[PDB]
Amino acid sequence: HHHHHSRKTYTLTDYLKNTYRLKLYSLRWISDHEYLYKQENNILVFNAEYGNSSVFLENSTFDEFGHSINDYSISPDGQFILLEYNYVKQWRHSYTASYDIYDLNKRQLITEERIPNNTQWVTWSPVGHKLAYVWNNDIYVKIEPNLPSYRITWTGKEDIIYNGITDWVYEEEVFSAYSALWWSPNGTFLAYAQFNDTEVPLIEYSFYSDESLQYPKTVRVPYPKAGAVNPTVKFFVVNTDSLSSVTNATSIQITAPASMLIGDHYLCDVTWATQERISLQWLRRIQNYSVMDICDYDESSGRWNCLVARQHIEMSTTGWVGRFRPSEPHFTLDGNSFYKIISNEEGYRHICYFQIDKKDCTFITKGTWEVIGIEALTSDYLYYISNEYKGMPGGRNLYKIQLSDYTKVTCLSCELNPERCQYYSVSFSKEAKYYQLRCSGPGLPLYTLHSSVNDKGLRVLEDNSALDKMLQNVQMPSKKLDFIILNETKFWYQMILPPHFDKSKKYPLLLDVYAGPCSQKADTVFRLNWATYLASTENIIVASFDGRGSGYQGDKIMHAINRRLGTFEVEDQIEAARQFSKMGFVDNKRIAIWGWSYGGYVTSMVLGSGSGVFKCGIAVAPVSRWEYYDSVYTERYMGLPTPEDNLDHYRNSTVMSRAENFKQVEYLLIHGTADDNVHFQQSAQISKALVDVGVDFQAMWYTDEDHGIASSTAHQHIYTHMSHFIKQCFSLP
Amino acid sequence: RKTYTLTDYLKNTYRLKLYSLRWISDHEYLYKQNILVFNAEYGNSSVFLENSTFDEFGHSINDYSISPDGQFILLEYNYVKQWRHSYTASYDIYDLNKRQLITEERIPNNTQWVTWSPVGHKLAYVWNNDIYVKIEPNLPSYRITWTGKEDIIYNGITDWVYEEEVFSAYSALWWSPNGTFLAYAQFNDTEVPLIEYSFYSDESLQYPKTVRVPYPKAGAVNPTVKFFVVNTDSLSSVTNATSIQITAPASMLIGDHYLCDVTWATQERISLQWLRRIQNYSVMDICDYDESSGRWNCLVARQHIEMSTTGWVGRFRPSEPHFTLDGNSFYKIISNEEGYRHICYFQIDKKDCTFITKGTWEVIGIEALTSDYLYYISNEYKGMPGGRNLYKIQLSDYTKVTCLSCELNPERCQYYSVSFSKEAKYYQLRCSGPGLPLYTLHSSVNDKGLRVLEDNSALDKMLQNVQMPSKKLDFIILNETKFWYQMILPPHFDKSKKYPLLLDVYAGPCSQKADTVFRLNWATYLASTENIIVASFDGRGSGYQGDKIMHAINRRLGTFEVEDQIEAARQFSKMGFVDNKRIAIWGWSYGGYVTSMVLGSGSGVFKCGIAVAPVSRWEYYDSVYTERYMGLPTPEDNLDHYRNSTVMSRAENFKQVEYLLIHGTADDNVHFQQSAQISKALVDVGVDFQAMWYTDEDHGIASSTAHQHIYTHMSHFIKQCFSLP
Ligand SMILES: *[C@@H]1O[C@H](CO)[C@@H](O[C@@H]2O[C@H](CO)[C@@H](O)[C@H](O)[C@H]2NC(C)=O)[C@H](O)[C@H]1NC(C)=O
Ligand SMILES: *[C@@H]1O[C@H](CO)[C@@H](O[C@@H]2O[C@H](CO)[C@@H](O)[C@H](O)[C@H]2NC(C)=O)[C@H](O)[C@H]1NC(C)=O
Ligand SMILES: *[C@@H]1O[C@H](CO)[C@@H](O[C@@H]2O[C@H](CO)[C@@H](O)[C@H](O)[C@H]2NC(C)=O)[C@H](O)[C@H]1NC(C)=O
Ligand SMILES: *[C@@H]1O[C@H](CO)[C@@H](O[C@@H]2O[C@H](CO)[C@@H](O)[C@H](O)[C@H]2NC(C)=O)[C@H](O)[C@H]1NC(C)=O
Ligand SMILES: Cn1c(=O)cc(N2CCC[C@@H](N)C2)n(Cc2cc(F)ccc2C#N)c1=O
Ligand SMILES: Cn1c(=O)cc(N2CCC[C@@H](N)C2)n(Cc2cc(F)ccc2C#N)c1=O
Ligand SMILES: *[C@@H]1O[C@H](CO)[C@@H](O)[C@H](O)[C@H]1NC(C)=O
Ligand SMILES: *[C@@H]1O[C@H](CO)[C@@H](O)[C@H](O)[C@H]1NC(C)=O
Ligand SMILES: *[C@@H]1O[C@H](CO)[C@@H](O)[C@H](O)[C@H]1NC(C)=O
Ligand SMILES: *[C@@H]1O[C@H](CO)[C@@H](O)[C@H](O)[C@H]1NC(C)=O
Ligand SMILES: *[C@@H]1O[C@H](CO)[C@@H](O)[C@H](O)[C@H]1NC(C)=O
Ligand SMILES: *[C@@H]1O[C@H](CO)[C@@H](O)[C@H](O)[C@H]1NC(C)=O
Ligand SMILES: *[C@@H]1O[C@H](CO)[C@@H](O)[C@H](O)[C@H]1NC(C)=O
Ligand SMILES: *[C@@H]1O[C@H](CO)[C@@H](O)[C@H](O)[C@H]1NC(C)=O
């Protein structure tokens, strides 16, 4: 006699086998009024206006193909489809693949002059059907899909010269992309970066492969660790309309400002402003100074001129420039003006309006909140996401501001579904006539389509009723999102609370940590994850805290750990734990901490702190000392590890130096052997230091797994392993 | 009141005293304290060098070495370990008759091997893979070889696989008995593939180093070998030394082969043994110096073949010959018709040898040979394969055999080794168990005891206070055949009680884990403090009991020796004092393989286990060892069984057990690879297990801190498996 009360919980197997599936609604805008979507592997076009859809491409159209198709891309003009197959993953964004082009009009595979195997990147021009691709680190252009390619670059060289694609650090830390090609708006020009890794040292590590491989392979990747020789970069623009089968193409170089050339620098943003005007942002290796150049094509010479009178400097006295890099400009149609996110006088990030000829910009938004991103710009309105609503830095809503009157700001998303929806992202149609809103929480995700004309809702695309239906009699956890005041400053936390949460009781507490610069772990997003299991099934509170160095609340918080990683952010997690115990529903003897990546570092620094607050913790793929990690991320926050810069704090902020203090705690250290990002080295050095002072700890290596430890089997194994460790640390049967 | 603790084991609270002498003549020996010479006669000892004669040397002296004539001492410093035996060092020579360091024409830094000639004070050494000879310590050295090249050509020193698996040594230099000739081998690793692994080094090193070592895994291209002899009495300052090659016999040059033994017979006769890559066929060459030629000749009529139809040849390699004084006769250990290893007497000029020992037991080694007597160690006494005693056989009558050690102290002493003086007039006996080690000195003329050198009374006194475990050594019968086991039994062993049991396994070919040796080790702690029985069992494949048992796993690694550890454990649970809910198993090296194969067997006998630096599949291990037992991993040889004998293939069965897998990341021997493939296989079938890597540790995991950490980590694991707080 169970009286239909909820007795199921969200189990580990539920998490690992995806029993409860979040439904997405992924679409790709092709025009201002149409998008594509998949239904049972068929590709449908949907017309946003009248809600209808015709099948665009049958699920069976490439049955005969003979290869499994990984992805596709349709040309802007709708006449060709690019089919990607033989996908082989490289780093976070990079991969190689084979490509075939299918003619949608003639309904046939192009068979002549095919894109080669092992292609590294492919991109349609933004209009028409020109193709640029990179193969063997060289850029090629096809003006028509069945015609011979024009080789643009001849300097490409494996691990040394990269044309049109990024090297390792630029991929992971600057562009968040493999691609380093930018077509001009109408496809006349093709801009590209060339990276030179010639004297960049190699990280070398073993890759064991299938058990058939008799001798392990040594992988060798150019990787600048902090203070090491960095890649250099050059920027070019080629006119694709004046290509020629008989003469090699002329790439016009756009050189960095002298203020950048006097030392090590980076190329940190590329943005076309018009058909004949491109903006570049460069960044000094000491990343507190950046320069935007605005460069016009000179018709009579066929070269590019960046007028000093249109240079813009963005700098910071309290930290680095930008959240992770200088923000990108959104240009007006005429290219004489642009909008960009920068920190205001009070350290808050807001949209500034620039004319290209003027040094002073004027802020169009302000307040003790921040603009997350500029999402679209029309002639009358600018659309942006911000955390203004209710002063909740972990919320996200879409707003629009009238360009002619800045006091006219409308929230488009705030009141749509206030209880269910407080974390929005947006996808606008090609000229902003429609937009898809994606609400990610705190309720179940919700995908809606809107006409921007008068912001009326057209329809619900996906409302996750199937999941809602399944969860009716499952004892799910809740999320408390709130703040504590420390030194007259709000710091936000979230708690994943077990079902039937009773403040009278004392719960074990797991502190789930990132805490890196501009991190945010206290937000309104709904998640089905390991923490859901721990709270639901194992009755553990899983909490996260955004202390100093956290993002989206201004520079006085975010920049507080400048040049001082492994200090305040570490201390604030410990303090968070003390505060959580102060709240009266936490068992002080069963507080644990875990993190991945920066969170691994913090977890480790906390467990080695001697605080006595934490019984145990898990560090997954942690940084152990900053000199081991890449230059652009590390130096952003730490400067250079030289006696004249910041070597002392590099040396003071290691987990190894704290080995002795791990005698007080139970520690599990986990690392993938093929981690190209945070090298296995980092954990190898932790383990060696703990061994050297005689502290027992648990370890797990993951053969051939990288930073994501994301293989289906490894992912299940690591979470199972961590679950056993936590349960035993907390004496849960 | 107290027990033998883990800290006791880890910190060496209770030390075993050795007595390590080094003979200088037929009646004198050195010993450390200070360095005394001792008389074998009287035991009177005048000092040779004061504890700090080298007070103002400045360098920490690793080891010393006196020239045979006593005129010079060689000081070794700046020791840096390479592999198991190999190392690099700096060297200085001190004139004893003048009392001063030689300062001219010194031995280079990073010298790889140095050796005195067997008489006088000639010196040969290896530096940058080339051989140099010094006639006098202060004079310039003559360069013998010019082909030495790092990782590629090795003159007078072994490459990785020859060091580890053939010679158990770095040196490949062999002086003739009076020092006239210097014989040397030359190895060529040119097409041997490289094992590559990361070395993380000190925290200060920003980018890991990639260590690369030529290492032939099973079936890979092997090193090639050449053998040379040079006359050191006709070296020139003007002309280059002329090294005479001795080529391997035509029966070996037909394919891949190995040089497996070098034994000088006389001043002008050298014996070489060669082994085919398929190691069931070896040939001994006897080569004589020709004065008018200046050449060495090995008559095909003097070739002696040793082969096996049931396995490989030798225990780990063909045995060494012991030539009579005139060098026309020799004695060596070979398998007889019944498959037992016994001493055969060969005449240089003929095919048939005659066995001078016989029976169902084995000769372990020929220890010394005189005109009247051959001295040897065997396990004959009481039919106990795990005992060892010294015997002498009257050369004029083989039926006259005296056991010299059996009856000296039968209770305390059943495991002897021996060190004879230069002409076998005196000998030191070393008893290693079952009681406390006992070192005694004896005169061979009448095999009388002279004196106790070390009796470990100091250790005996300390142990009085400690609840020490006992050893049971006994056998069981499987298929009308005896298989021996030993058990470390906790103190106050109550056979009406049910004890947890840990099976300690090696179980490799020619292994022996059941013996009469006394040990203070991890098992002592587990027995004394944790009341765990620690058992070992010598099944099929095990050694010193004849070929029928040893060759039983020929071409079939990971079969019978694995089943027999399982069957042993079953038998132990039927002994009534074993808790069958708490049986574990662990092992290192081959024992990690077997442990892993056992735990993946699905037998249900074992709750848990620990594999340390295990082999996971035979293609990952070196060619010399692996192929000895497995042949080649090719379709026409033994590929199928290479494929059938992996621990990865048993991954699914690890669901029934708790496994701890441990490996050093700089293991040059069993590559970290092997455990990496185990862990991946267990991950891929969703088996949870425990792991531990040891950063920059090698196959020994022998760094002081790492040693303590692994045993501590393992102890927690077994205690938790056994529900011991
Ligand atoms: C990439 O950068 C390297 C420098 O790291 C350039 O190599 C130098 O080239 C100049 C002129 O040819 C020489 O004087 C230097 O000696 C070179 N230095 C080296 C090889 O370390 C190289 O030219 C660059 N390559 C490209 C294609 O831009
Ligand atoms: C072996 O190396 C040592 C140390 O590097 C040598 O001694 C050094 O010799 C240099 C001259 O080359 C002097 O400047 C140093 O003062 C010496 N250092 C020390 C610590 O002694 C030594 O001479 C080298 N070679 C031999 C044959 O001994
Ligand atoms: C060591 O072995 C290598 C590999 O067999 C020998 O190298 C060959 O030498 C011959 C004649 O000099 C060349 O024609 C081949 O091309 C070489 N092969 C290589 C390098 O792979 C080498 O001669 C041997 N060295 C010694 C000292 O015995
Ligand atoms: C002893 O032999 C060596 C090695 O062949 C000779 O040294 C080489 O001589 C050749 C040319 O004659 C050079 O190309 C080599 O580079 C030399 N050195 C080495 C280390 O290979 C040496 O000349 C010979 N000595 C005498 C006295 O004949
Ligand atoms: C937890 N977490 C993330 O989810 C994403 C991260 N970065 C942010 C900067 C841009 C990308 N490189 C992704 N980082 C930063 C980081 C810090 C380290 F110390 C070591 C490794 C990473 C990494 N991937 C994180 O920590
Ligand atoms: C337990 N144990 C030993 O104590 C000594 C061993 N060898 C015997 C042959 C000569 C030397 N290589 C020492 N072996 C053999 C072995 C087998 C493996 F499968 C993997 C690795 C080793 C190794 N060192 C052992 O197993
Ligand atoms: C939607 O409806 C209109 C009818 O006016 C039609 O012309 C258009 O092609 C339709 N699009 C579809 C079904 O995708
Ligand atoms: C790519 O791969 C396969 C061969 O493995 C072949 O069928 C195809 O023609 C290759 N080359 C190109 C240019 O596609
Ligand atoms: C283009 O450049 C390459 C290399 O610089 C050269 O070999 C090739 O001949 C050139 N082609 C033309 C048409 O100039
Ligand atoms: C693209 O832009 C360029 C530069 O303004 C211009 O010359 C060209 O006419 C444009 N092409 C098309 C097809 O609109
Ligand atoms: C940039 O950083 C360096 C080192 O921290 C500092 O000396 C310099 O003044 C900074 N620049 C600005 C504009 O704050
Ligand atoms: C021991 O005594 C003898 C007796 O004369 C003496 O000749 C010898 O040198 C001594 N040996 C040692 C090592 O003291
Ligand atoms: C050493 O043996 C060699 C070769 O037999 C011989 O020529 C030489 O005379 C011997 N030397 C001495 C001093 O015995
Ligand atoms: C050596 O081994 C091979 C392969 O097992 C076998 O065929 C051959 O007969 C053996 N040789 C001898 C002499 O037994």
Residue numbers in the entry:
A (entry chain B): 34 to 766
B (entry chain A): 40 to 72, 75 to 766
Give the exact sentences the study uses for this entry.
The 2-position carbonyl participates in an important hydrogen bond with the backbone NH of Tyr631, and the uracil ring π-stacks with Tyr547. The single chemical structural difference between the two compounds is the presence of a fluorine atom at the 5-position of the cyanobenzyl group. Of these residues, only hydrogen atoms are within Van der Waals distance of the fluorine. These hydrogen atoms carry a permanent partial positive charge due to the position on the aromatic rings of Trp659 and Tyr631, and an inducible positive charge on the side chain of Val656. The magnitude of this attraction would be expected to be small but may be responsible for the 4-fold potency increase observed for trelagliptin versus alogliptin.
Dipeptidyl peptidase-4 (DPP-4), the serine protease responsible for metabolism of the incretin hormones glucagon-like peptide-1 and glucose-dependent insulinotropic polypeptide, plays an important role in regulating glucose homeostasis. Trelagliptin (SYR-472, zafatek) is a novel once-weekly DPP-4 inhibitor approved in Japan.
